[PDB]
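Quarterly update, task 2.4: protoporphyrin IX containing FE-bound model.
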Amino acid sequence: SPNLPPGFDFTDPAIYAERLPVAEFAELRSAAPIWWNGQDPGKGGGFHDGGFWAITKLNDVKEISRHSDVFSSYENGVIPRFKNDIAREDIEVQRFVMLNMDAPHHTRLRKIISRGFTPRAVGRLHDELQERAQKIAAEAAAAGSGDFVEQVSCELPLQAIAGLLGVPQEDRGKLFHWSNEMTGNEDPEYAHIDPKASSAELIGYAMKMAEEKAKADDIVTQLIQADGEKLSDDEFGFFVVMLAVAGNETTRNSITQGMMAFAEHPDQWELYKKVRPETAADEIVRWATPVTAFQRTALRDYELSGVQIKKGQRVVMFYRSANFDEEVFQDPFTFNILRNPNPHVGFGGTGAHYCIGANLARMTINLIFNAVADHMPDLKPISAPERLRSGWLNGIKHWQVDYTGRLPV
Ligand code: HEM
């Protein structure tokens, strides 16, 4: 019996528009580490099953992640919150991306797409991203002050996707426009955006890219040629839509919130500026936990840590709670860029769906923080961050920063 308000719902977007429910997750870890989060009829974020099991401990997140025959991604998809009135068919179309597939379909697609994320493929992007990171941080610093989210955090993740896919320089503006429309839409600031339209345009663009690349040594060629497996044009289209969501706002929020952590822990920022430890990226992702939660649905009864999960019930893995698990991390509430080992689940629990982009993301994070250290070492915030209204993505919309640190306060 945890101490929470009547009807509290850990996927309620109205919570995340204002704060992370840190105290409430700590309460569950302590008192009810697997807890039934009931949901009133019509208040289930698109699911009409009465609620879900909140999973708060790291070991439980890993156990659910491993057992993908029991804990399905396909059955209800992995996003645990949409608009309450969403039609079921709009939840089910998510099954066209590999993140919402189970074996065998997932297994085939994962094996093919892994070609795009080899050490060689990712390292080939390094120098361009480093150069781009340097210019992003210089141009921002020269502006004196501005919105850190737009002027520092947004562009590099987009350029990492563009560089991975070999998107022509002239096509990057339109690619980025579509991609920025494809996630974060539950907030009134973005209420007028139609993600479905952008997703359709991206698919059309990507399918042509496949068409034409059949007509080189690059990731797109490798994906659409027999290894004997290959993506069809449409499988490529859905792979690109998946990246446009999986790898954009996530990395962006890691950058914003990693900078917010440095502002809050100036001794760590001083240490970072001197040492530039590559371990910083993992601590940044643990602290930022850009995906608050993903869900699964049990396909059979399963006893998890002494709790009887029943066939059909959803389990929601709160990576935001697991990443602060007092039994796993030493003093998880302090930000330590040298933390090592750092067994966080910000990229998922180990398992079939573990973030395929994780090394690309760490590289993007490390390059942008190097550039920030280089060009704006004295930065200070001007005002509090503005959070995103979403029941599953932990987002910062805007954050006004004085890059020079010279302004008062
Ligand atoms: C800090 C930034 C990022 C975070 C926090 C993040 C987090 C995650 C998480 C939690 C999952 C699901 C893991 C699971 O269910 O076990 C995932 C899957 C995925 N991520 Fe990332 N990710 C990030 C960056 C990226 C980037 C940069 C890319 C590619 C450009 C990417 C591509 C993908 C893909 C394609 C999947 C689906 C893999 C599958 O279902 O087999 N991610 N990510």
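Highlight for this quarter: The longest helix spans residues 195-213.
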